[PDB]
XYZ file of N, CA and C in Angstrom:
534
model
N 102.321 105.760 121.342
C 103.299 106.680 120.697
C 102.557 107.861 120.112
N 102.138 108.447 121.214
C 101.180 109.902 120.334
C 101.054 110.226 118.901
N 100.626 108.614 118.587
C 100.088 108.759 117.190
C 99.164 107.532 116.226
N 98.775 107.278 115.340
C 98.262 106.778 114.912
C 98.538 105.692 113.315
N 98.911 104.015 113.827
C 98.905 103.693 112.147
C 97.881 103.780 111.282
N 97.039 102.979 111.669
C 95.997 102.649 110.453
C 94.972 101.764 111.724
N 93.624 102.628 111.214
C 92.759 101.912 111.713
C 91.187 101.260 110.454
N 91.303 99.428 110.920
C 90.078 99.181 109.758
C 89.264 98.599 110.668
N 88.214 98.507 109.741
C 86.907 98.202 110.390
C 85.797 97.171 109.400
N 85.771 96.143 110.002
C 85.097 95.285 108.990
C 83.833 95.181 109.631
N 82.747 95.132 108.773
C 81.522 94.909 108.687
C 80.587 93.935 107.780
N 79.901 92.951 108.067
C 78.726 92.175 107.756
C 78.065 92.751 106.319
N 77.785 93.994 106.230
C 77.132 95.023 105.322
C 78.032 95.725 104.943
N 77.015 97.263 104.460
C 77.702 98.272 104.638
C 77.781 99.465 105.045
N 77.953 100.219 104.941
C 77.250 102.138 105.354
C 77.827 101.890 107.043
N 79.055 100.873 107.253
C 79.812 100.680 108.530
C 78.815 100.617 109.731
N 77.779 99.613 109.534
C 76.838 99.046 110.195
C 77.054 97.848 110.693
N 76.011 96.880 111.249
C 76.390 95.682 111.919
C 76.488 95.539 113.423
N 77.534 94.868 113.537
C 78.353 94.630 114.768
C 80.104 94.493 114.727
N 80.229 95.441 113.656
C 81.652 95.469 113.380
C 82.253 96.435 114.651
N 83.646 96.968 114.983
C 84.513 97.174 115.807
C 84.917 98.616 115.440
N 86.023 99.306 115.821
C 86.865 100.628 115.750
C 87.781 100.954 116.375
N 88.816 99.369 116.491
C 90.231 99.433 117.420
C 91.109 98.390 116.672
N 91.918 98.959 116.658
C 93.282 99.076 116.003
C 93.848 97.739 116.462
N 94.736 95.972 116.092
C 94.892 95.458 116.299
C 95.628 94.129 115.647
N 95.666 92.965 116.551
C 96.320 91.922 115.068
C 95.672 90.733 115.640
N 94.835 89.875 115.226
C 94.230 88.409 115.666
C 94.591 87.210 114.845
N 94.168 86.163 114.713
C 93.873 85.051 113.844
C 92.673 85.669 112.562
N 91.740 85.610 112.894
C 91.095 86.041 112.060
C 89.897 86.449 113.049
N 89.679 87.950 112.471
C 88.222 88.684 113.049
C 86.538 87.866 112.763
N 86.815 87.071 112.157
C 85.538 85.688 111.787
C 85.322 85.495 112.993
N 85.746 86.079 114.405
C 85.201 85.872 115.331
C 84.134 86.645 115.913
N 84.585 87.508 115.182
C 83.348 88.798 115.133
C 82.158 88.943 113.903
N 82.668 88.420 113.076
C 81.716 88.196 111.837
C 82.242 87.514 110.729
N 81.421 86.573 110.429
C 82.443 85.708 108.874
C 82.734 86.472 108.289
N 81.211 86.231 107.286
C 82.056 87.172 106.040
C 81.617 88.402 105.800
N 82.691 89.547 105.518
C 82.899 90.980 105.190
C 82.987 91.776 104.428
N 82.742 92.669 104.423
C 82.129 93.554 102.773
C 83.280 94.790 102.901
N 82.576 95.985 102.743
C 83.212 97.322 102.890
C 84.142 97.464 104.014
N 84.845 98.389 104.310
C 85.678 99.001 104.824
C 86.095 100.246 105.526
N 86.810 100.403 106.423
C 87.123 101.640 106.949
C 88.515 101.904 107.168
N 89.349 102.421 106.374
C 90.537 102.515 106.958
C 91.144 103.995 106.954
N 91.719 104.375 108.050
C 92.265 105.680 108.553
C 93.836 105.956 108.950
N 94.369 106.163 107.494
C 95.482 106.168 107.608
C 96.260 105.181 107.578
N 97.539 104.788 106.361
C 97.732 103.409 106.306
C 96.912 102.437 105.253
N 97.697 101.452 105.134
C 97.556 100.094 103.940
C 97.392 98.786 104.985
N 96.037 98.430 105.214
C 95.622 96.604 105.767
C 95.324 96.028 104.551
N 96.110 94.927 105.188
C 96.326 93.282 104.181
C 95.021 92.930 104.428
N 94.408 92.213 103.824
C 93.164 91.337 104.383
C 93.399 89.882 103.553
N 93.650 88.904 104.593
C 93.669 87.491 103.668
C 92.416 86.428 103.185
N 92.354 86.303 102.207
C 91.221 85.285 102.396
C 90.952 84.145 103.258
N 92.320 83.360 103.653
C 91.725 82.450 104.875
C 92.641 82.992 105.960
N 92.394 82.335 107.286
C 93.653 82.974 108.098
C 94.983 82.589 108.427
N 95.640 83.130 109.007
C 96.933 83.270 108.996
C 97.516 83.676 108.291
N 97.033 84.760 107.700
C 97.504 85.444 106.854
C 97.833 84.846 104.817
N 96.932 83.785 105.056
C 96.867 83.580 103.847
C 95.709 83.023 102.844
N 95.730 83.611 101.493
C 94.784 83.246 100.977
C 94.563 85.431 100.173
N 94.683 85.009 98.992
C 94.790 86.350 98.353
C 95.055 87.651 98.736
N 94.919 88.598 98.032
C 95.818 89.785 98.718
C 94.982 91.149 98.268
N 94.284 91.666 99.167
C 93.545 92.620 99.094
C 94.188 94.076 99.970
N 94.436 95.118 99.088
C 95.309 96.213 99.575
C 94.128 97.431 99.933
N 94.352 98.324 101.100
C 93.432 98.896 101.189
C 94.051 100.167 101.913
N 93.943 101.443 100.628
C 95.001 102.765 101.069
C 94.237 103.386 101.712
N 94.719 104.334 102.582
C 93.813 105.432 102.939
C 93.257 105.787 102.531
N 92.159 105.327 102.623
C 90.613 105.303 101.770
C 89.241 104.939 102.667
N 88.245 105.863 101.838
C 86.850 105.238 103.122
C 86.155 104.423 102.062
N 85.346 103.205 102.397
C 84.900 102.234 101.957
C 83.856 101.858 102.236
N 82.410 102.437 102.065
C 81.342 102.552 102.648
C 80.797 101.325 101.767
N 80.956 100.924 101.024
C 80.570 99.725 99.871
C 81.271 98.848 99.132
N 81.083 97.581 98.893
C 82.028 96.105 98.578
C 82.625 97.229 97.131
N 82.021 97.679 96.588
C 81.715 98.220 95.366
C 83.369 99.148 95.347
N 83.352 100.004 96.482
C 83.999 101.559 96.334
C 85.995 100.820 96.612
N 85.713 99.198 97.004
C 87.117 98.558 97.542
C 87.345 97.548 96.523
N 87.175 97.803 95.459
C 86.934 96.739 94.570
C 87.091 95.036 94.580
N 85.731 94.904 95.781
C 85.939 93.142 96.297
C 85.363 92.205 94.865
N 85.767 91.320 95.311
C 85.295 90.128 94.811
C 83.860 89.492 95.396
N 83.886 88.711 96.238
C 83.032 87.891 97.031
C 82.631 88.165 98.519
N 82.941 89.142 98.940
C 82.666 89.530 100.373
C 83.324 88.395 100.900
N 84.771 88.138 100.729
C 85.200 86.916 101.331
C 86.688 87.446 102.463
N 86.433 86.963 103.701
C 87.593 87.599 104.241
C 87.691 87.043 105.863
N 88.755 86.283 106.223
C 88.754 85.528 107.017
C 90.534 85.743 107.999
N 91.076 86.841 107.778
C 92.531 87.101 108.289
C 92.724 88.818 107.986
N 93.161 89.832 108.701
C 93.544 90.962 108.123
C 95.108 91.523 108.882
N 95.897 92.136 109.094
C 96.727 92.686 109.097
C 97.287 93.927 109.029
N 97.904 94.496 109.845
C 98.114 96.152 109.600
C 99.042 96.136 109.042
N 99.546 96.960 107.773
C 100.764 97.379 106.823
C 101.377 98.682 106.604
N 102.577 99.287 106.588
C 102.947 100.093 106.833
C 103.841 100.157 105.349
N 104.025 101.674 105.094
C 104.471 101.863 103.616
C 106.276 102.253 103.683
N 106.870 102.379 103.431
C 108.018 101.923 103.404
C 109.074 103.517 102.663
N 109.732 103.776 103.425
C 110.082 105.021 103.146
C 110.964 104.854 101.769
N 111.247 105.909 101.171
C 111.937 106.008 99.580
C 110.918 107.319 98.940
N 111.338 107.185 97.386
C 109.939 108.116 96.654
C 110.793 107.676 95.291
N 111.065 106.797 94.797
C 111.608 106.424 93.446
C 110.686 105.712 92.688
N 110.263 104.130 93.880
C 109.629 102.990 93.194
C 109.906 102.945 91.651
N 111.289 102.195 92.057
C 111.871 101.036 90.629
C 110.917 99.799 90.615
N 110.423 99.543 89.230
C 109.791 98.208 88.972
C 110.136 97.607 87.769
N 111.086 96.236 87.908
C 111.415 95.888 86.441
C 110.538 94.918 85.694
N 110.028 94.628 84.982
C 109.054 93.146 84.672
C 109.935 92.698 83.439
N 109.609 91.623 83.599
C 110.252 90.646 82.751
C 109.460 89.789 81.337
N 109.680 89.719 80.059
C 108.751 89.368 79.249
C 108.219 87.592 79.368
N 109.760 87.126 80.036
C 109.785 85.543 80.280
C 109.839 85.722 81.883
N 109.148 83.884 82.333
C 109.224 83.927 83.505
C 110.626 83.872 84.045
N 111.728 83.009 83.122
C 112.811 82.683 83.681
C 113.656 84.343 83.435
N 113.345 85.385 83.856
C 114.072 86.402 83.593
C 114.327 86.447 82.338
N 113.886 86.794 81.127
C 114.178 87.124 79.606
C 113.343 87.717 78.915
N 114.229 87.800 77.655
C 113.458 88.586 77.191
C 113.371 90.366 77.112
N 112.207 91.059 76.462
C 112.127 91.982 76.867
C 112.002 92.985 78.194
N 113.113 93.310 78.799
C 112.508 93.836 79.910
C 112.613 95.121 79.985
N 111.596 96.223 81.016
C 111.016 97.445 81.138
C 111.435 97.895 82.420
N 112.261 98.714 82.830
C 113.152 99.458 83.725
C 112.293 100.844 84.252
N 111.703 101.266 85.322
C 111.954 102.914 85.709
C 110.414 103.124 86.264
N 110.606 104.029 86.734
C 109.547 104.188 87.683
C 108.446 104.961 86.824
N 107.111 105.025 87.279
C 106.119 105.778 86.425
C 104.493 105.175 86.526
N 103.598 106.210 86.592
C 102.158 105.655 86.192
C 102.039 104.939 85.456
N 101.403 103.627 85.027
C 101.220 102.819 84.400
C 99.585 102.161 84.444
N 99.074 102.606 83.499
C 97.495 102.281 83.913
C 97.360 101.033 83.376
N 97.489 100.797 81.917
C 97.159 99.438 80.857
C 98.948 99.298 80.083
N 99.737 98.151 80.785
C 100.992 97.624 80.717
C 100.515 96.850 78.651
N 99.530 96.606 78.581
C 99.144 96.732 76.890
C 99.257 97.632 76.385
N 100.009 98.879 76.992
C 99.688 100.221 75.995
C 101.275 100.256 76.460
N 101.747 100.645 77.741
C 103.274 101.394 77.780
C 104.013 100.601 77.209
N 103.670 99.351 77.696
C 105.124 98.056 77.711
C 104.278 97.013 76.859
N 103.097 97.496 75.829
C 102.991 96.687 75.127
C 102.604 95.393 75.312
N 102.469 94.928 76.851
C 102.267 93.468 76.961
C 100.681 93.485 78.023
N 99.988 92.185 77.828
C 99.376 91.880 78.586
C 99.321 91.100 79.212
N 100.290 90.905 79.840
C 100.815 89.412 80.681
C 102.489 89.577 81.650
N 102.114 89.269 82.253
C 103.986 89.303 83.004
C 104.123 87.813 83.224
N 105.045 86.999 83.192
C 105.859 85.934 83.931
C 106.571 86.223 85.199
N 107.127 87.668 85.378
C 107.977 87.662 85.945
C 108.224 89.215 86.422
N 108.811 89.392 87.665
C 108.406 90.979 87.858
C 109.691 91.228 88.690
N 110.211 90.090 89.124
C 112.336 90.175 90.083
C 111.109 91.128 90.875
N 113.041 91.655 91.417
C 112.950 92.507 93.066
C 112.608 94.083 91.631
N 111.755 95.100 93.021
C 111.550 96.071 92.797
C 112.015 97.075 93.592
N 111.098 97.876 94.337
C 111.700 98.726 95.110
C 110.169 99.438 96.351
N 110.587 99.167 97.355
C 109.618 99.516 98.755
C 108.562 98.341 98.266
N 107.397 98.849 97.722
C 106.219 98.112 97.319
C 105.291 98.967 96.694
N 105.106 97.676 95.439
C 103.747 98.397 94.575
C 102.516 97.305 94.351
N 102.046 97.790 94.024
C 99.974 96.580 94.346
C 99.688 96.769 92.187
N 99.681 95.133 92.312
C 98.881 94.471 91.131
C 97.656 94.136 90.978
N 97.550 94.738 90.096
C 95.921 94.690 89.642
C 95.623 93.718 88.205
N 94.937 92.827 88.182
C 94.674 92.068 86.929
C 93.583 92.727 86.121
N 92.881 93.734 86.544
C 92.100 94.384 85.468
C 92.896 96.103 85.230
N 92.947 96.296 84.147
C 93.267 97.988 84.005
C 92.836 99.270 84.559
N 93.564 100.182 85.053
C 92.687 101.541 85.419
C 92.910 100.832 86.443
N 93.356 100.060 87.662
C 93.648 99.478 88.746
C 92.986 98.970 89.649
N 92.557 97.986 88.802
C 91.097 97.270 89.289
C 91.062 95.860 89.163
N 90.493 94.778 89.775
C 90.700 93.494 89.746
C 91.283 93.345 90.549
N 90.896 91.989 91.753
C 91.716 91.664 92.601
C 93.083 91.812 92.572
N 93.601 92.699 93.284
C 95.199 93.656 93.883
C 95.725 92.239 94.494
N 97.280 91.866 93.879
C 97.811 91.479 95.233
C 99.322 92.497 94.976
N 99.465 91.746 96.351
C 100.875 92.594 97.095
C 101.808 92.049 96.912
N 103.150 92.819 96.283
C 104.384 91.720 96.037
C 105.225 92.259 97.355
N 105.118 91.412 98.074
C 105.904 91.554 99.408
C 107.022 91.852 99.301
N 108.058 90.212 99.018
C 109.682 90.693 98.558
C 110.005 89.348 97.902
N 111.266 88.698 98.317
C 111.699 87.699 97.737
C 111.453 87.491 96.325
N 112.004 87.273 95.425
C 112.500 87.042 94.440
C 110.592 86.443 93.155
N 110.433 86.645 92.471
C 109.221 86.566 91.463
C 109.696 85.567 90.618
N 110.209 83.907 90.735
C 110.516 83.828 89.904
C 109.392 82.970 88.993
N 108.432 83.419 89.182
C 106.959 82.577 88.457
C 106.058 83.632 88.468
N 104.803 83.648 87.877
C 103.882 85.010 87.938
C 103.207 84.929 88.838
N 103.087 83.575 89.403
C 102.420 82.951 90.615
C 103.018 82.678 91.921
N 104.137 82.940 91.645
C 105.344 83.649 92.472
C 104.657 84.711 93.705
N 103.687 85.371 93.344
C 102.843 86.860 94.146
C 101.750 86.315 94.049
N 101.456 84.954 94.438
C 100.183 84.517 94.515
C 99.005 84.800 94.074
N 99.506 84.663 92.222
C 98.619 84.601 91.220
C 98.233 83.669 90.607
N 97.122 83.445 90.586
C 96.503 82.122 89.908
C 97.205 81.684 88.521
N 97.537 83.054 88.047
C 97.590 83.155 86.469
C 98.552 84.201 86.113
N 99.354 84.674 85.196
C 100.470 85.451 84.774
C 99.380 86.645 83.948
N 97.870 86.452 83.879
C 97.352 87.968 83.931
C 97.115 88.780 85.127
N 98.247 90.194 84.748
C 97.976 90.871 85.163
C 98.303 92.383 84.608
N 97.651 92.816 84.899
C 97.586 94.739 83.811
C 98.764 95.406 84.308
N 98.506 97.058 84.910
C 99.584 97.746 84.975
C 99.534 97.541 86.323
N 99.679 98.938 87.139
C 100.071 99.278 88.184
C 100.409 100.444 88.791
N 100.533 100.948 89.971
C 100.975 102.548 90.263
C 101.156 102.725 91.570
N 102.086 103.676 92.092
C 102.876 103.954 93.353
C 101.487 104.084 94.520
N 102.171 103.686 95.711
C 101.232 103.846 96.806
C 101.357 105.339 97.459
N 100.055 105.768 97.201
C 100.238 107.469 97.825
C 99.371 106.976 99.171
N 99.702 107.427 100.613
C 98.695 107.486 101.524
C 98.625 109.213 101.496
């Protein structure tokens, strides 16, 4: 289609060395080409990368961005065994409501907006609960938007672990620009 989604590129190292690849695709897991993976290359477009495969096992978001170092993609463990191509979802509002209780209660925070440290706007450092939002936005458990990201896909949040979080810490958050 005379055009282009998103192309990534996983590598062993970094400085996009190795025996890593530069074609666009969907497998089980690229561990067939190299276990485990560091930095990044992506061109245009948001890839999932899962920790184990089939698409599951934590949630690492990766915007149009170059990623010459574990460092510049803010990894964890060079751990990565499933990836996925993702596509961003038309709108320009991104509604996000969070909830102070998991069971929906409580204080809750309505409307779209930058949100760096959810301890400073909305006062809290913790969510239970986050319901339906709007297209998709990426969680970060450290502030300034950092700490393993996951992705709230869709279906309903009704636990904090609900978005396949270990734990109900997590900081702010902010709209996906490609």
């Amino acid at each position: 289609g005379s055009k282009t989604g998103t192309k990534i590129t996983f590598y062993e190292d970094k400085n996009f060395q190795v025996r890593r690849y530069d074609c666009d695709c969907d497998c089980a897991d690229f561990h067939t080409y190299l276990s485990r993976c560091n930095s990044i290359k992506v061109e245009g477009g948001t890839w999932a990368v899962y920790e184990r495969p089939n698409f599951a096992g934590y949630m690492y978001i990766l915007p149009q961005g170059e990623y010459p170092e574990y460092q510049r993609w803010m990894g964890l463990n060079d751990r990565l065994s499933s990836c996925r191509a993702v596509h961003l979802p038309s709108g320009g509002q991104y509604k996000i409501q969070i909830f102070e209780k998991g069971d929906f209660s409580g204080q809750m925070y309505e409307t779209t907006e930058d949100c760096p440290s959810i301890m400073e706007q909305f006062h809290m450092r913790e969510i239970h609960s986050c319901k339906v939002l709007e297209g998709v936005w990426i969680f970060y458990e450290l502030p300034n938007y950092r700490g393993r990201q996951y992705l709230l896909d869709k279906k309903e949040y009704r636990k904090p672990i609900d978005w396949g979080a270990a734990s109900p810490a997590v900081q702010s958050f902010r709209r996906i620009v490609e």
